[PDB]
């Protein structure tokens, strides 16, 4: 299987965004 | 024997055309930033109702890739003999498979045995989040390594990561903004920050400068200047080379020169010595932590704060500072002797397995057609074997002496990191000058 | 076809073996002492070989 | 022994040394690269410290 | 995936014709000339033989070549007799007849024949003191076959050096020598008298 | 951690950091020519275009940065001077204010960082990537070179080169809006009418066939510039003299492309068209308009009534003192002082004259096959009648072009080129005996053959030495 | 059992985002590649041949006209393939110097593929037209093209004799 580099970069960026979103949503649910 | 696994493991396609230099530099500069962002992000699940590579999505980090590379280099040295493309493809597939397996196992053992949230206290549906985060980080790292190795990058991923980590540690030790309140007013860990603060907010300027230079507790200015001087000296020394004349025999007339630098097999002996001392220190520490009630184990290594002392590992331990050296003269003597001998012999041994032996270079020049431009029928092998081994055995001792002197003078960070960063950036500059601009 | 299946089974056995040995720090405490004793014996054999090499070098020097 | 030091000194005296111009050029290039990498890493870490502290709560 | 062009067949003539409007004058005249050439090829093929398939270019019908050689021999005899008018007239007639060779047949034979005929007609025009016509005929001849046509280069250079423009003659003889022997010696002698 | 805000350490930190980052940034804000006494018409326009060609501020990029840095430094030193009056154990803190860790601005700074990382970085990266992939090595849009590549033909020289060159891409940005409709009619009428049939044989058809008004306007302007037509309006002249330089750059690119093909006629035509563009004479006209005061009226009378050749500068200057009675009587011709200045500026033109062009190999005498043999060509520079050469005359274009020299060699049997040219722009100082070298690997054979070399010079028209050299291989 | 499906949902949404982004990028790249303009101007003889076939299917045109149309189309195609074979080497040699972007190379590759497919289709149609009439059509086409361009060059060089005669009469 072959993929493009920009796909990998967007995947890594979305992974970082998913981690930070998990953190912030856990902090939000904690306050409630 | 790994034929069925080839279509499973994904990869990135090879560059269709010859990538230019600007786009390659952009790829490198974006990959390094992505790696740093990955290494400076907190993990999830660490909060359980009661950060430097501890929860930074890099617990496994680069260790599986480099471990697989080392073990496969050792296997290849022990013997993939034929140099066809199929052997290279099988080697790369085995590399990637072993890497993913080792990364998954490391993540699982790290999340299960401890050092993080406990399974009983946390639960049975939370640790899997940690496992998935870690394996995703490992897969992204092993895929960006191949993205930089396939040709889109200028060097290797692991070397670039080590260089940027060393330079980051140096710059952080330089301009640290964190304070430490050990009494008598807080102080800045950063060198220049403290040199400014103590100079400005204290009435006794002279004593302030005197204690700011020779602090010896936090990174100070004098050792920073020593690091800068060692950097300049090694940069000036890297450029040595013995240009030996050579004229071709097939296409008559064309001249040239064959360079043989003083740092032959660059930064290889220091890396081998560092690995050896790290392994022996780990073995001695693990043995003393359990079987301390013994005689030969006590003679091998005794540890007390964290720092080895009164043992073989004590002699193996590098000197801390100038005073820590001059207090024990014979210790410094034996350490200098061991370091020089080990570096020299490591260079002289690695020069054979690396394939740069005088016989191999002579055969390569004979096959390529290059012939010595001697006075009257000079044999290339004679002068080559007269020059090369001396150069290697001297460069080994020289780089060992430089590393030990940098460690004794108290340079910022260990000398191995300085030498590695210097030689990596020098190789980058060399290839950039080889290519256009 | 049968040789391909045999090779695939051999590869599966190899990968399950390596996946098991990498998880060795999670031993069930049944065979940990025997492995430690085997490692100690191997270390003793290596030390004896190194001592023999050092003795041979010192003898050849004289 | 002592012949090794003599051979090393002979090899050094026979080796050619870089001049001032090429040394200055290579030093400038290496310093630029090193400072760029260090500044990138340092600003990344210093930016992520407060964000990390606010996220981890 | 084809652009539709409404046509109209002409009965009793089988010559296609573009219908009333490509809605563009450029495209209109382009397709008009194209249909003209297509009808020309159709006429040629229908005059070929009841089997409309074109024969392969391996064999060559020698009747046309024999007619060309006969006409050339008679014209050469008439020119050597002393007259030049009917000589160049029959030269042009043979040139037209050789140009009447269809296209599907090989091109080397027709090229060589036109080269020879144009060189002969240029020599005849030079005998007639027709310098520009002789020069352009020599240029056409050397354009047909540039290799081994030393007589063509020599006649062209002679026409040039006769009618002026010495630099043109210089460049002509330079290219001749570059391509290049009695012909080479004659070219060198002509260049020396420039 | 505990971000300290009582002892006020973050002022010191930000002060030293901003000072270190703004101290070096302050420094961001802190050959000969030939002698002539001629001034062409519309000198103001061409001089204005020349001055507009080069411009660089390089101040707005760092002025805001340095001023905000010094403002931060001033505010922080004010805070220090104000707060210093008020300014058995192990803890670590950070020198940053307490407002960041406060729950009020937490979500705000988090959203700011998220928006930054998600917007500012990828957008600027893509913009930089596209900007880098836009241009090519020869300083031209890749689309322009790609479009001009297709228009290449097997054998084209002179006329069709201009047509194949007019299909550039800079004209799209240059003639945007109603600029095409403003001029097209007048410029096309003028070019189609006033030009003779000799300077335009069949290119009128190609000029009429094209429909894109931008390309047609560009081609009409190009043909108006290459003939010194001086079409009557004060607005189109600047666009004309700009299309001149655009065509020069496109001609460089097309020369590179034709050399990439490999041929003799396309290259020998591209060099001539570069000479004609940089000299502003029509390709094929008499190369006597290089002199400053000469007009078509006087060149139609100095070289006779009409002839298929053209009197070059050498043959003209080598004439006896008869040309005075031919073109200085001045019924509609030049005057005495004008003619004197014309000769004075003609007596200072470069004209290479080779005298020895022989091969040689380094190390031995007889050159062996498949070896590196370097050819030496040494000739003195004589005007008709590392040292920098004087700039080109070039009185009809904004930029000043350093006269280069393209030296190469080919053969006539196969009709292709053998070795790519080796250009240079300097000599080693009538005058003394200069020297020029060039090296290439001879083909591996045993039979010796002949070559022809070309001393084709750009920036001038009428200086072309063609000498043949015979190679030798013995072994 | 939600504490286990929450990470399962995380994996599901992650792999779904991966899949949808891969599909979107692949579709966008395919659309951008298909947006490349054709290499050479639209073929004309193929249009005439297809319109003739359509007219024949509508009604009664003699097939000899169709054979002539196919011959002309083959001549056009052989000229096109000669041109592309001449240009391929120059394009490959120039691509390394960087004076030509990659879009031109992509257009050239697509044009080469389309030309190969078209030449295969036309030779198959020719074989279907007449018994074993496959490989001779290209010999006929190359000979026709060469003779035609040679005749055109000859007529062009011949047509300019009047101006030369007038100039000679003027100078005389």
mmCIF file with all atom_site columns, N, CA and C in Angstrom, chain D:
data_model
loop_
_atom_site.group_PDB
_atom_site.id
_atom_site.type_symbol
_atom_site.label_atom_id
_atom_site.label_alt_id
_atom_site.label_comp_id
_atom_site.label_asym_id
_atom_site.label_entity_id
_atom_site.label_seq_id
_atom_site.pdbx_PDB_ins_code
_atom_site.Cartn_x
_atom_site.Cartn_y
_atom_site.Cartn_z
_atom_site.occupancy
_atom_site.B_iso_or_equiv
_atom_site.pdbx_formal_charge
_atom_site.auth_seq_id
_atom_site.auth_comp_id
_atom_site.auth_asym_id
_atom_site.auth_atom_id
_atom_site.pdbx_PDB_model_num
ATOM 1   N N  . UNK D 1 1  ? 54.119 3.035  22.774 1.00 0.00 ? 1  UNK D N  1
ATOM 2   C CA . UNK D 1 1  ? 55.478 3.559  22.940 1.00 0.00 ? 1  UNK D CA 1
ATOM 3   C C  . UNK D 1 1  ? 55.585 5.033  22.564 1.00 0.00 ? 1  UNK D C  1
ATOM 4   N N  . UNK D 1 2  ? 56.668 5.397  21.875 1.00 0.00 ? 2  UNK D N  1
ATOM 5   C CA . UNK D 1 2  ? 56.882 6.769  21.441 1.00 0.00 ? 2  UNK D CA 1
ATOM 6   C C  . UNK D 1 2  ? 56.843 6.946  19.931 1.00 0.00 ? 2  UNK D C  1
ATOM 7   N N  . UNK D 1 3  ? 56.963 5.863  19.160 1.00 0.00 ? 3  UNK D N  1
ATOM 8   C CA . UNK D 1 3  ? 56.920 5.981  17.707 1.00 0.00 ? 3  UNK D CA 1
ATOM 9   C C  . UNK D 1 3  ? 55.541 6.402  17.217 1.00 0.00 ? 3  UNK D C  1
ATOM 10  N N  . UNK D 1 4  ? 54.487 6.055  17.959 1.00 0.00 ? 4  UNK D N  1
ATOM 11  C CA . UNK D 1 4  ? 53.139 6.444  17.561 1.00 0.00 ? 4  UNK D CA 1
ATOM 12  C C  . UNK D 1 4  ? 52.977 7.958  17.567 1.00 0.00 ? 4  UNK D C  1
ATOM 13  N N  . UNK D 1 5  ? 53.517 8.628  18.588 1.00 0.00 ? 5  UNK D N  1
ATOM 14  C CA . UNK D 1 5  ? 53.436 10.083 18.640 1.00 0.00 ? 5  UNK D CA 1
ATOM 15  C C  . UNK D 1 5  ? 54.201 10.715 17.484 1.00 0.00 ? 5  UNK D C  1
ATOM 16  N N  . UNK D 1 6  ? 55.364 10.156 17.143 1.00 0.00 ? 6  UNK D N  1
ATOM 17  C CA . UNK D 1 6  ? 56.134 10.683 16.021 1.00 0.00 ? 6  UNK D CA 1
ATOM 18  C C  . UNK D 1 6  ? 55.382 10.508 14.709 1.00 0.00 ? 6  UNK D C  1
ATOM 19  N N  . UNK D 1 7  ? 54.766 9.340  14.507 1.00 0.00 ? 7  UNK D N  1
ATOM 20  C CA . UNK D 1 7  ? 53.997 9.115  13.287 1.00 0.00 ? 7  UNK D CA 1
ATOM 21  C C  . UNK D 1 7  ? 52.796 10.049 13.214 1.00 0.00 ? 7  UNK D C  1
ATOM 22  N N  . UNK D 1 8  ? 52.131 10.278 14.347 1.00 0.00 ? 8  UNK D N  1
ATOM 23  C CA . UNK D 1 8  ? 51.007 11.200 14.353 1.00 0.00 ? 8  UNK D CA 1
ATOM 24  C C  . UNK D 1 8  ? 51.421 12.626 14.044 1.00 0.00 ? 8  UNK D C  1
ATOM 25  N N  . UNK D 1 9  ? 52.533 13.075 14.631 1.00 0.00 ? 9  UNK D N  1
ATOM 26  C CA . UNK D 1 9  ? 53.021 14.419 14.346 1.00 0.00 ? 9  UNK D CA 1
ATOM 27  C C  . UNK D 1 9  ? 53.441 14.553 12.888 1.00 0.00 ? 9  UNK D C  1
ATOM 28  N N  . UNK D 1 10 ? 54.048 13.504 12.327 1.00 0.00 ? 10 UNK D N  1
ATOM 29  C CA . UNK D 1 10 ? 54.402 13.529 10.912 1.00 0.00 ? 10 UNK D CA 1
ATOM 30  C C  . UNK D 1 10 ? 53.159 13.624 10.037 1.00 0.00 ? 10 UNK D C  1
ATOM 31  N N  . UNK D 1 11 ? 52.129 12.833 10.349 1.00 0.00 ? 11 UNK D N  1
ATOM 32  C CA . UNK D 1 11 ? 50.894 12.886 9.574  1.00 0.00 ? 11 UNK D CA 1
ATOM 33  C C  . UNK D 1 11 ? 50.238 14.256 9.675  1.00 0.00 ? 11 UNK D C  1
ATOM 34  N N  . UNK D 1 12 ? 50.283 14.870 10.858 1.00 0.00 ? 12 UNK D N  1
ATOM 35  C CA . UNK D 1 12 ? 49.680 16.188 11.029 1.00 0.00 ? 12 UNK D CA 1
ATOM 36  C C  . UNK D 1 12 ? 50.452 17.235 10.236 1.00 0.00 ? 12 UNK D C  1
ATOM 37  N N  . UNK D 1 13 ? 51.785 17.206 10.328 1.00 0.00 ? 13 UNK D N  1
ATOM 38  C CA . UNK D 1 13 ? 52.596 18.178 9.603  1.00 0.00 ? 13 UNK D CA 1
ATOM 39  C C  . UNK D 1 13 ? 52.480 17.995 8.096  1.00 0.00 ? 13 UNK D C  1
ATOM 40  N N  . UNK D 1 14 ? 52.232 16.767 7.637  1.00 0.00 ? 14 UNK D N  1
ATOM 41  C CA . UNK D 1 14 ? 52.048 16.532 6.211  1.00 0.00 ? 14 UNK D CA 1
ATOM 42  C C  . UNK D 1 14 ? 50.649 16.915 5.750  1.00 0.00 ? 14 UNK D C  1
ATOM 43  N N  . UNK D 1 15 ? 49.657 16.798 6.627  1.00 0.00 ? 15 UNK D N  1
ATOM 44  C CA . UNK D 1 15 ? 48.297 17.182 6.283  1.00 0.00 ? 15 UNK D CA 1
ATOM 45  C C  . UNK D 1 15 ? 48.215 18.677 6.001  1.00 0.00 ? 15 UNK D C  1
ATOM 46  N N  . UNK D 1 16 ? 47.323 19.045 5.088  1.00 0.00 ? 16 UNK D N  1
ATOM 47  C CA . UNK D 1 16 ? 47.089 20.446 4.778  1.00 0.00 ? 16 UNK D CA 1
ATOM 48  C C  . UNK D 1 16 ? 46.006 21.005 5.693  1.00 0.00 ? 16 UNK D C  1
ATOM 49  N N  . UNK D 1 17 ? 46.098 22.299 5.966  1.00 0.00 ? 17 UNK D N  1
ATOM 50  C CA . UNK D 1 17 ? 45.193 22.941 6.901  1.00 0.00 ? 17 UNK D CA 1
ATOM 51  C C  . UNK D 1 17 ? 44.265 23.908 6.173  1.00 0.00 ? 17 UNK D C  1
ATOM 52  N N  . UNK D 1 18 ? 43.037 24.084 6.656  1.00 0.00 ? 18 UNK D N  1
ATOM 53  C CA . UNK D 1 18 ? 42.132 25.045 6.021  1.00 0.00 ? 18 UNK D CA 1
ATOM 54  C C  . UNK D 1 18 ? 42.577 26.476 6.276  1.00 0.00 ? 18 UNK D C  1
ATOM 55  N N  . UNK D 1 19 ? 42.288 27.341 5.308  1.00 0.00 ? 19 UNK D N  1
ATOM 56  C CA . UNK D 1 19 ? 42.662 28.746 5.401  1.00 0.00 ? 19 UNK D CA 1
ATOM 57  C C  . UNK D 1 19 ? 41.642 29.488 6.263  1.00 0.00 ? 19 UNK D C  1
ATOM 58  N N  . UNK D 1 20 ? 41.694 30.819 6.237  1.00 0.00 ? 20 UNK D N  1
ATOM 59  C CA . UNK D 1 20 ? 40.781 31.610 7.053  1.00 0.00 ? 20 UNK D CA 1
ATOM 60  C C  . UNK D 1 20 ? 39.416 31.758 6.392  1.00 0.00 ? 20 UNK D C  1
ATOM 61  N N  . UNK D 1 21 ? 39.382 31.905 5.067  1.00 0.00 ? 21 UNK D N  1
ATOM 62  C CA . UNK D 1 21 ? 38.125 32.191 4.382  1.00 0.00 ? 21 UNK D CA 1
ATOM 63  C C  . UNK D 1 21 ? 37.178 30.997 4.429  1.00 0.00 ? 21 UNK D C  1
ATOM 64  N N  . UNK D 1 22 ? 37.665 29.815 4.041  1.00 0.00 ? 22 UNK D N  1
ATOM 65  C CA . UNK D 1 22 ? 36.809 28.633 4.055  1.00 0.00 ? 22 UNK D CA 1
ATOM 66  C C  . UNK D 1 22 ? 36.400 28.269 5.476  1.00 0.00 ? 22 UNK D C  1
ATOM 67  N N  . UNK D 1 23 ? 37.303 28.458 6.441  1.00 0.00 ? 23 UNK D N  1
ATOM 68  C CA . UNK D 1 23 ? 36.950 28.210 7.834  1.00 0.00 ? 23 UNK D CA 1
ATOM 69  C C  . UNK D 1 23 ? 35.837 29.142 8.287  1.00 0.00 ? 23 UNK D C  1
ATOM 70  N N  . UNK D 1 24 ? 35.946 30.430 7.959  1.00 0.00 ? 24 UNK D N  1
ATOM 71  C CA . UNK D 1 24 ? 34.894 31.375 8.316  1.00 0.00 ? 24 UNK D CA 1
ATOM 72  C C  . UNK D 1 24 ? 33.572 30.996 7.661  1.00 0.00 ? 24 UNK D C  1
ATOM 73  N N  . UNK D 1 25 ? 33.614 30.584 6.394  1.00 0.00 ? 25 UNK D N  1
ATOM 74  C CA . UNK D 1 25 ? 32.386 30.224 5.689  1.00 0.00 ? 25 UNK D CA 1
ATOM 75  C C  . UNK D 1 25 ? 31.712 29.016 6.330  1.00 0.00 ? 25 UNK D C  1
ATOM 76  N N  . UNK D 1 26 ? 32.480 27.949 6.574  1.00 0.00 ? 26 UNK D N  1
ATOM 77  C CA . UNK D 1 26 ? 31.889 26.739 7.136  1.00 0.00 ? 26 UNK D CA 1
ATOM 78  C C  . UNK D 1 26 ? 31.422 26.984 8.566  1.00 0.00 ? 26 UNK D C  1
ATOM 79  N N  . UNK D 1 27 ? 32.153 27.810 9.322  1.00 0.00 ? 27 UNK D N  1
ATOM 80  C CA . UNK D 1 27 ? 31.726 28.136 10.676 1.00 0.00 ? 27 UNK D CA 1
ATOM 81  C C  . UNK D 1 27 ? 30.420 28.913 10.662 1.00 0.00 ? 27 UNK D C  1
ATOM 82  N N  . UNK D 1 28 ? 30.294 29.881 9.752  1.00 0.00 ? 28 UNK D N  1
ATOM 83  C CA . UNK D 1 28 ? 29.049 30.632 9.643  1.00 0.00 ? 28 UNK D CA 1
ATOM 84  C C  . UNK D 1 28 ? 27.887 29.721 9.275  1.00 0.00 ? 28 UNK D C  1
ATOM 85  N N  . UNK D 1 29 ? 28.097 28.813 8.320  1.00 0.00 ? 29 UNK D N  1
ATOM 86  C CA . UNK D 1 29 ? 27.021 27.912 7.911  1.00 0.00 ? 29 UNK D CA 1
ATOM 87  C C  . UNK D 1 29 ? 26.586 27.010 9.062  1.00 0.00 ? 29 UNK D C  1
ATOM 88  N N  . UNK D 1 30 ? 27.553 26.387 9.740  1.00 0.00 ? 30 UNK D N  1
ATOM 89  C CA . UNK D 1 30 ? 27.225 25.472 10.830 1.00 0.00 ? 30 UNK D CA 1
ATOM 90  C C  . UNK D 1 30 ? 26.555 26.220 11.975 1.00 0.00 ? 30 UNK D C  1
ATOM 91  N N  . UNK D 1 31 ? 27.044 27.421 12.293 1.00 0.00 ? 31 UNK D N  1
ATOM 92  C CA . UNK D 1 31 ? 26.434 28.204 13.360 1.00 0.00 ? 31 UNK D CA 1
ATOM 93  C C  . UNK D 1 31 ? 25.010 28.602 13.005 1.00 0.00 ? 31 UNK D C  1
ATOM 94  N N  . UNK D 1 32 ? 24.769 28.982 11.749 1.00 0.00 ? 32 UNK D N  1
ATOM 95  C CA . UNK D 1 32 ? 23.416 29.333 11.328 1.00 0.00 ? 32 UNK D CA 1
ATOM 96  C C  . UNK D 1 32 ? 22.485 28.141 11.497 1.00 0.00 ? 32 UNK D C  1
ATOM 97  N N  . UNK D 1 33 ? 22.899 26.975 10.998 1.00 0.00 ? 33 UNK D N  1
ATOM 98  C CA . UNK D 1 33 ? 22.060 25.793 11.135 1.00 0.00 ? 33 UNK D CA 1
ATOM 99  C C  . UNK D 1 33 ? 21.775 25.445 12.586 1.00 0.00 ? 33 UNK D C  1
ATOM 100 N N  . UNK D 1 34 ? 22.822 25.441 13.413 1.00 0.00 ? 34 UNK D N  1
ATOM 101 C CA . UNK D 1 34 ? 22.676 25.066 14.816 1.00 0.00 ? 34 UNK D CA 1
ATOM 102 C C  . UNK D 1 34 ? 21.768 26.042 15.555 1.00 0.00 ? 34 UNK D C  1
ATOM 103 N N  . UNK D 1 35 ? 21.977 27.343 15.348 1.00 0.00 ? 35 UNK D N  1
ATOM 104 C CA . UNK D 1 35 ? 21.171 28.347 16.032 1.00 0.00 ? 35 UNK D CA 1
ATOM 105 C C  . UNK D 1 35 ? 19.723 28.273 15.573 1.00 0.00 ? 35 UNK D C  1
ATOM 106 N N  . UNK D 1 36 ? 19.492 28.034 14.279 1.00 0.00 ? 36 UNK D N  1
ATOM 107 C CA . UNK D 1 36 ? 18.122 27.913 13.790 1.00 0.00 ? 36 UNK D CA 1
ATOM 108 C C  . UNK D 1 36 ? 17.413 26.735 14.445 1.00 0.00 ? 36 UNK D C  1
ATOM 109 N N  . UNK D 1 37 ? 18.064 25.569 14.463 1.00 0.00 ? 37 UNK D N  1
ATOM 110 C CA . UNK D 1 37 ? 17.447 24.390 15.068 1.00 0.00 ? 37 UNK D CA 1
ATOM 111 C C  . UNK D 1 37 ? 17.174 24.613 16.552 1.00 0.00 ? 37 UNK D C  1
ATOM 112 N N  . UNK D 1 38 ? 18.158 25.167 17.267 1.00 0.00 ? 38 UNK D N  1
ATOM 113 C CA . UNK D 1 38 ? 17.985 25.403 18.689 1.00 0.00 ? 38 UNK D CA 1
ATOM 114 C C  . UNK D 1 38 ? 16.880 26.394 18.991 1.00 0.00 ? 38 UNK D C  1
ATOM 115 N N  . UNK D 1 39 ? 16.803 27.477 18.213 1.00 0.00 ? 39 UNK D N  1
ATOM 116 C CA . UNK D 1 39 ? 15.755 28.465 18.430 1.00 0.00 ? 39 UNK D CA 1
ATOM 117 C C  . UNK D 1 39 ? 14.380 27.878 18.149 1.00 0.00 ? 39 UNK D C  1
ATOM 118 N N  . UNK D 1 40 ? 14.260 27.073 17.088 1.00 0.00 ? 40 UNK D N  1
ATOM 119 C CA . UNK D 1 40 ? 12.980 26.432 16.793 1.00 0.00 ? 40 UNK D CA 1
ATOM 120 C C  . UNK D 1 40 ? 12.540 25.566 17.967 1.00 0.00 ? 40 UNK D C  1
ATOM 121 N N  . UNK D 1 41 ? 13.426 24.673 18.419 1.00 0.00 ? 41 UNK D N  1
ATOM 122 C CA . UNK D 1 41 ? 13.068 23.809 19.533 1.00 0.00 ? 41 UNK D CA 1
ATOM 123 C C  . UNK D 1 41 ? 12.734 24.586 20.794 1.00 0.00 ? 41 UNK D C  1
ATOM 124 N N  . UNK D 1 42 ? 13.535 25.612 21.099 1.00 0.00 ? 42 UNK D N  1
ATOM 125 C CA . UNK D 1 42 ? 13.343 26.372 22.327 1.00 0.00 ? 42 UNK D CA 1
ATOM 126 C C  . UNK D 1 42 ? 12.022 27.118 22.312 1.00 0.00 ? 42 UNK D C  1
ATOM 127 N N  . UNK D 1 43 ? 11.686 27.758 21.191 1.00 0.00 ? 43 UNK D N  1
ATOM 128 C CA . UNK D 1 43 ? 10.417 28.466 21.136 1.00 0.00 ? 43 UNK D CA 1
ATOM 129 C C  . UNK D 1 43 ? 9.258  27.483 21.190 1.00 0.00 ? 43 UNK D C  1
ATOM 130 N N  . UNK D 1 44 ? 9.414  26.289 20.608 1.00 0.00 ? 44 UNK D N  1
ATOM 131 C CA . UNK D 1 44 ? 8.352  25.288 20.702 1.00 0.00 ? 44 UNK D CA 1
ATOM 132 C C  . UNK D 1 44 ? 8.112  24.907 22.157 1.00 0.00 ? 44 UNK D C  1
ATOM 133 N N  . UNK D 1 45 ? 9.189  24.609 22.887 1.00 0.00 ? 45 UNK D N  1
ATOM 134 C CA . UNK D 1 45 ? 9.044  24.199 24.282 1.00 0.00 ? 45 UNK D CA 1
ATOM 135 C C  . UNK D 1 45 ? 8.459  25.321 25.135 1.00 0.00 ? 45 UNK D C  1
ATOM 136 N N  . UNK D 1 46 ? 8.965  26.544 24.967 1.00 0.00 ? 46 UNK D N  1
ATOM 137 C CA . UNK D 1 46 ? 8.491  27.655 25.783 1.00 0.00 ? 46 UNK D CA 1
ATOM 138 C C  . UNK D 1 46 ? 7.043  28.001 25.471 1.00 0.00 ? 46 UNK D C  1
ATOM 139 N N  . UNK D 1 47 ? 6.612  27.824 24.221 1.00 0.00 ? 47 UNK D N  1
ATOM 140 C CA . UNK D 1 47 ? 5.211  28.057 23.893 1.00 0.00 ? 47 UNK D CA 1
ATOM 141 C C  . UNK D 1 47 ? 4.339  26.958 24.484 1.00 0.00 ? 47 UNK D C  1
ATOM 142 N N  . UNK D 1 48 ? 4.815  25.713 24.457 1.00 0.00 ? 48 UNK D N  1
ATOM 143 C CA . UNK D 1 48 ? 3.978  24.607 24.902 1.00 0.00 ? 48 UNK D CA 1
ATOM 144 C C  . UNK D 1 48 ? 3.914  24.460 26.417 1.00 0.00 ? 48 UNK D C  1
ATOM 145 N N  . UNK D 1 49 ? 4.826  25.074 27.167 1.00 0.00 ? 49 UNK D N  1
ATOM 146 C CA . UNK D 1 49 ? 4.761  24.973 28.631 1.00 0.00 ? 49 UNK D CA 1
ATOM 147 C C  . UNK D 1 49 ? 3.431  25.490 29.185 1.00 0.00 ? 49 UNK D C  1
ATOM 148 N N  . UNK D 1 50 ? 3.018  26.738 28.920 1.00 0.00 ? 50 UNK D N  1
ATOM 149 C CA . UNK D 1 50 ? 1.741  27.187 29.503 1.00 0.00 ? 50 UNK D CA 1
ATOM 150 C C  . UNK D 1 50 ? 0.545  26.434 28.955 1.00 0.00 ? 50 UNK D C  1
ATOM 151 N N  . UNK D 1 51 ? 0.567  26.079 27.668 1.00 0.00 ? 51 UNK D N  1
ATOM 152 C CA . UNK D 1 51 ? -0.531 25.308 27.094 1.00 0.00 ? 51 UNK D CA 1
ATOM 153 C C  . UNK D 1 51 ? -0.610 23.935 27.746 1.00 0.00 ? 51 UNK D C  1
ATOM 154 N N  . UNK D 1 52 ? 0.541  23.292 27.954 1.00 0.00 ? 52 UNK D N  1
ATOM 155 C CA . UNK D 1 52 ? 0.554  22.006 28.643 1.00 0.00 ? 52 UNK D CA 1
ATOM 156 C C  . UNK D 1 52 ? -0.005 22.137 30.053 1.00 0.00 ? 52 UNK D C  1
ATOM 157 N N  . UNK D 1 53 ? 0.389  23.190 30.772 1.00 0.00 ? 53 UNK D N  1
ATOM 158 C CA . UNK D 1 53 ? -0.094 23.362 32.138 1.00 0.00 ? 53 UNK D CA 1
ATOM 159 C C  . UNK D 1 53 ? -1.599 23.601 32.171 1.00 0.00 ? 53 UNK D C  1
ATOM 160 N N  . UNK D 1 54 ? -2.126 24.360 31.209 1.00 0.00 ? 54 UNK D N  1
ATOM 161 C CA . UNK D 1 54 ? -3.560 24.635 31.205 1.00 0.00 ? 54 UNK D CA 1
ATOM 162 C C  . UNK D 1 54 ? -4.351 23.401 30.785 1.00 0.00 ? 54 UNK D C  1
ATOM 163 N N  . UNK D 1 55 ? -3.810 22.593 29.871 1.00 0.00 ? 55 UNK D N  1
ATOM 164 C CA . UNK D 1 55 ? -4.517 21.389 29.445 1.00 0.00 ? 55 UNK D CA 1
ATOM 165 C C  . UNK D 1 55 ? -4.537 20.342 30.551 1.00 0.00 ? 55 UNK D C  1
ATOM 166 N N  . UNK D 1 56 ? -3.385 20.093 31.182 1.00 0.00 ? 56 UNK D N  1
ATOM 167 C CA . UNK D 1 56 ? -3.322 19.060 32.209 1.00 0.00 ? 56 UNK D CA 1
ATOM 168 C C  . UNK D 1 56 ? -4.086 19.470 33.462 1.00 0.00 ? 56 UNK D C  1
ATOM 169 N N  . UNK D 1 57 ? -4.365 20.762 33.624 1.00 0.00 ? 57 UNK D N  1
ATOM 170 C CA . UNK D 1 57 ? -5.105 21.290 34.772 1.00 0.00 ? 57 UNK D CA 1
ATOM 171 C C  . UNK D 1 57 ? -4.454 20.903 36.097 1.00 0.00 ? 57 UNK D C  1
#
